[PDB]
């Protein structure tokens, strides 16, 4: 921990660049998380919403 | 844009709607704005 000023930065780093990817396997509500997957079966009108 | 239908489907004109005249025949785009008359001509056409 002697040099734990300098490993913090790293952690602090990897850990937001590593929510900000996993924040995409979320719905939000949608009915699928995987775009092409929603758009491959639901028409564009309601596609679009 | 004039024309003659049947009461079955009749309700396919109409932004994202699909059948036989929607697919085939008449298209209205997702965004159309105007309106949409129509009317029984029983008397005229039967």
Redesign the interface.
């Known amino acids: 921990s002697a040099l734990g000023k300098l490993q913090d930065v790293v952690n602090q780093n990897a850990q937001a660049l590593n929510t900000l990817v996993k924040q995409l396997s979320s719905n939000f509500g949608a009915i699928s998380s995987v775009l092409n997957d929603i758009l491959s079966r639901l ?4 596609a679009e919403v | 844009d004039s024309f003659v239908i049947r009461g079955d489907e009749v309700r396919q004109i109409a ?2 709607q ?1 059948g036989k005249i929607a697919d085939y025949n008449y298209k209205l785009p ?1 965004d159309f704005t105007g309106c949409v008359i129509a009317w029984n001509s029983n008397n005229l056409d039967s």
């Open positions: 028409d564009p009108p309601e | 932004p994202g699909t997702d």
